């Protein structure tokens, strides 16, 4: 019933700078009788369980260093992280406990901000072994780029093909602070054999114009 | 020091 | 202080029930509460209910329409959550977490519950043939997870293994890729090693320029 919102969705921070993320509750989280404000903050690092950061709006959980701080009114809250480092990458959630049911905000993702880097693009045709199966996959790889936002279009004999692709993206790599992304186009082999040029077109802030990689079936 | 587990669930 | 250890991964058919456990050890508190929190793949956190065993109190979420039952065994200091009438939408990682006067101070490691009408199936592994990139497509398996390594684990630099996607067929798919010096193709061999423990699958595939 109490709705929790957070801002922004994603927050890039340069190393050693300060992250500030906000949370808003649709009702006051002040318990006017015991005088506390029941707002908690949690961090979930990639692939890990959530872990406690803040409780009662401004108190740090055990072992949490003082560069994490919580503040706010009774409805609008701020988590401040100073001297941001790679280990702080992940999703931050606020959660209210003034009233049952406990409710979470949607999460704000923090990553490390580096210079814009264009993807290296690769396209892979189906193997002869997959063709024998009756169903084939065409894979487009976008490698080591920043920021995370990127788009892929599939074209068959130059015509846009929608509806039969799925994408997958890596977490940010700590070695170079980049992302990678795959896009996979699934077709029947009879469809695949009925055309010739397969291409993926990639758009990203690092690229001055969209890049296309393609192959001709059989070549 | 009293212990608050949840809404209406605080204990001596 | 407290450590919370959860039971192992579960695979269920729609309509079935599953019972998860959370055993607490370490220091003892006379007053505490245990909650369950779930997270669907790629989504946010969702509180499901909690229990305060010393007080005999429980709290549930209406949305779950009474399908969740949380119980505690004082003797073994274990808490259970039973979720009934499972559907595909209950597929998620489930965490238990404990409150002792602050927030959720300690959390379990999570347990993956997969709910699907699919049957156990080992993956097909296809070469993705070509700085050069190459890789392996690991396709049509169930359930999660698979593991992928390159050259028996000796090749780790430049490797990316993507999170799996659920295909509309009900089966999972992923790719693992690696980038290598272009000159090293044909002077070096590249093999991906794929394990899928639920189906007792071990597959090696050599990846070559066609």
Numbering used by the authors:
A (entry chain L): 1 to 30, 30A, 30B, 30C, 30D, 30E, 30F, 31 to 213
B (entry chain P): 305 to 309, 312 to 318
C (entry chain H): 1 to 52, 52A, 53 to 82, 82A, 82B, 82C, 83 to 126, 135 to 214
The paper states:
The human immunodeficiency virus subtype 1 (HIV-1) envelope (Env) protein is a heterodimeric trimer consisting of gp120 and gp41 subunits. The gp120 engages its receptor CD4, afterwhich, it undergoes conformational changes that expose variable loop regions and the coreceptor binding site on an open Env conformation. Here, we have isolated from Env-vaccinated macaques three new V3 peptide-specific monoclonal antibodies. Crystal structures of two of the antibodies revealed that one antibody approached the V3 loop head-on, while the other antibody approached the V3 loop from the side.
Monoclonal antibody DH727.2 was isolated from a neonatal macaque immunized with CH505 gp120. DH727.2 Fab was crystallized in complex with ZAM18 V3 peptide (gp120301-325) to 1.8 Å resolution. Electron density of the V3 peptide was sufficient to build 14 residues comprising the central segment (residues 305–318) of the peptide. Structural analysis of liganded-DH727 confirmed that DH727.2 had an overlapping epitope with V3 Ab 307432. DH727.2 further resembled other V3 crown antibodies in that it showed an oblique approach to the V3 crown β-hairpin conformation. Primary interactions between antibody DH727.2 and antigen were hydrogen (H)-bonds between the terminal amides of the V3 Arg308 side chain with the side chain hydroxyl and backbone carbonyl of Thr97 on the light chain. H-bonds were also observed with the side chain of V3 residue Gln315 and both heavy chain residue Asn59 and light chain residue Thr100. These interactions provided a structural explanation for why Arg308 and Gln315 were found to be a virus sequence signature and were important for peptide binding. Lastly, favorable H-bonding was also observed between the backbone carbonyl of V3 residue Ile309 and the side chain of Arg99 in HCDR3. When the DH727 structure was aligned onto a single gp120 of a closed envelope trimer there was unrealistic overlap, giving 102 clashes between backbone atoms of the Fab heavy chain and the V1V2 domain.
